[PDB]
């Protein structure tokens, strides 16, 4: 429970600054794309038997 | 020295406490604790982020 | 002990002291912290 | 027609991750706001950072008087006293606001029995480290080299924070707290 915090608005106010430097830093090393890996894997043999 | 500081300072700070009486071994360590503990925690805290 | 053990904290009190002897005169004590500083 | 291109350890240069003074930029804003968080202030944290030099000076000596470098064993047993220093420290300046905030004190009479009840310990912690890193600091022969490097820069940067903590950490204090506080 909170109430706690109240009289420490210095530790509470910490907890969310942490927090925010944590992710955010994140942000600068997270990958970027469009969609995550999505579709299902596949593999291809490929055979030649000329003529 | 990070391992062992951590006794020393749980052990200087309740022999210093049979300077608040004459005997008693108990309550002597548990007075330093609980004004000692929170402090204990937040130096890992600080040395995490060392 | 009398010369052994109470030989040890002995330069407690001339220490605590010493503290008695800290920015007492005027203003200017934090100057040798910051050649220390300059130090490295 | 003629080109080129890096191998080998020259490849390895330009890529690393992410520097050094950057992430200990980070290390100090987290540390200011852990302190901050404990003390419940953004003015008694300034007590025990400014403890982090009275270490590495000594570290920077004694790595200057004998051959050493700075190598990654030099950097470990200089953050291992960067932290030990400030630990201890946080022990003062705990004392000090307690023996005041919770006993009604101050000016000096809070700084007072603190730095007098926080200095039996410290001198037993060094000297529990630096006796027993000794060995390590003129080491035998077989590996020795590493050991000496650990060694002759812990002690040599432990030796000088002990006794300069020890005058120096009451200072910040007070005038840190005086001086933020509104001058």
């Given at each position: 429970?909170?109430?706690?915090f109240?009289?420490?608005?210095?530790?509470?106010?910490?907890?969310?600054?942490?927090?925010?430097?944590?992710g955010?830093?994140?942000?600068?090393?997270?990958?970027?794309?469009?969609?995550?890996?999505?579709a299902?894997?596949?593999?291809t043999?490929?055979?030649?038997?000329?003529? | 020295?990070?391992?062992?500081?951590?006794?020393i300072?749980?052990?200087?700070?309740?022999?210093?406490?049979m300077?608040?009486?004459?005997?008693?071994?108990?309550?002597?360590?548990?007075?330093?604790?609980?004004?000692?503990?929170?402090?204990?925690?937040?130096?890992?805290?600080?040395?995490?982020?060392? | 002990?009398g010369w052994?053990?109470?030989?040890?904290?002995?330069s407690?009190h001339?220490?605590?002291?010493?503290?008695?002897?800290?920015?007492?005169?005027?203003?200017?004590?934090?100057?040798?912290?910051?050649?220390?500083?300059?130090?490295? | 027609?003629?080109?080129?291109?890096?191998?080998?350890?020259?490849?390895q240069?330009?890529?690393?991750?992410?520097?050094?003074?950057?992430?200990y930029?980070?290390?100090?804003?987290?540390?200011?706001?852990?302190?901050?968080?404990?003390?419940?202030?953004?003015?008694?944290?300034?007590?025990?950072?400014?403890?982090?030099?009275?270490?590495?000076?000594?570290?920077?000596?004694?790595?200057?008087?004998?051959?050493?470098?700075?190598?990654?064993?030099?950097?470990?047993?200089?953050?291992?006293?960067?932290?030990?220093?400030?630990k201890?420290?946080?022990?003062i300046?705990?004392?000090?606001?307690?023996?005041?905030?919770?006993?009604?004190?101050?000016?000096?009479?809070?700084?007072?029995?603190?730095?007098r009840?926080?200095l039996?310990?410290?001198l037993?912690t060094?000297?529990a480290?630096?006796?027993?890193?000794?060995?390590?600091?003129?080491?035998?022969?077989?590996?020795?080299?590493?050991?000496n490097?650990?060694?002759?820069?812990?002690?040599?940067?432990?030796?000088?924070?002990?006794?300069?903590?020890?005058?120096?950490?009451?200072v910040?204090?007070?005038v840190?707290?005086?001086?933020?506080?509104?001058?």
């Amino acid at each position: 429970m909170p109430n706690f915090f109240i009289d420490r608005p210095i530790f509470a106010w910490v907890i969310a600054i942490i927090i925010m430097l944590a992710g955010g830093l994140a942000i600068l090393k997270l990958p970027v794309a469009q969609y995550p890996t999505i579709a299902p894997p596949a593999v291809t043999i490929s055979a030649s038997y000329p003529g | 020295g990070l391992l062992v500081d951590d006794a020393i300072v749980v052990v200087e700070n309740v022999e210093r406490v049979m300077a608040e009486e004459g005997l008693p071994p108990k309550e002597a360590t548990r007075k330093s604790m609980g004004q000692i503990q929170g402090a204990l925690v937040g130096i890992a805290m600080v040395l995490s982020a060392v | 002990f009398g010369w052994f053990n109470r030989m040890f904290e002995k330069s407690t009190h001339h220490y605590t002291d010493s503290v008695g002897g800290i920015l007492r005169s005027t203003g200017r004590y934090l100057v040798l912290y910051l050649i220390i500083v300059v130090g490295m | 027609g003629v080109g080129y291109d890096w191998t080998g350890m020259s490849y390895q240069e330009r890529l690393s991750g992410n520097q050094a003074p950057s992430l200990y930029a980070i290390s100090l804003i987290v540390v200011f706001l852990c302190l901050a968080a404990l003390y419940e202030s953004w003015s008694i944290p300034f007590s025990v950072m400014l403890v982090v030099p009275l270490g590495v000076i000594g570290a920077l000596l004694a790595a200057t008087f004998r051959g050493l470098t700075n190598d990654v064993y030099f950097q470990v047993g200089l953050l291992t006293t960067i932290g030990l220093s400030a630990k201890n420290a946080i022990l003062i300046v705990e004392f000090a606001k307690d023996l005041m905030d919770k006993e009604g004190k101050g000016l000096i009479e809070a700084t007072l029995d603190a730095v007098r009840m926080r200095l039996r310990p410290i001198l037993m912690t060094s000297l529990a480290f630096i006796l027993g890193v000794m060995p390590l600091v003129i080491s035998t022969g077989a590996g020795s080299g590493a050991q000496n490097a650990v060694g002759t820069g812990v002690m040599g940067g432990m030796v000088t924070a002990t006794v300069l903590a020890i005058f120096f950490v009451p200072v910040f204090f007070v005038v840190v707290r005086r001086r933020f506080s509104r001058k």
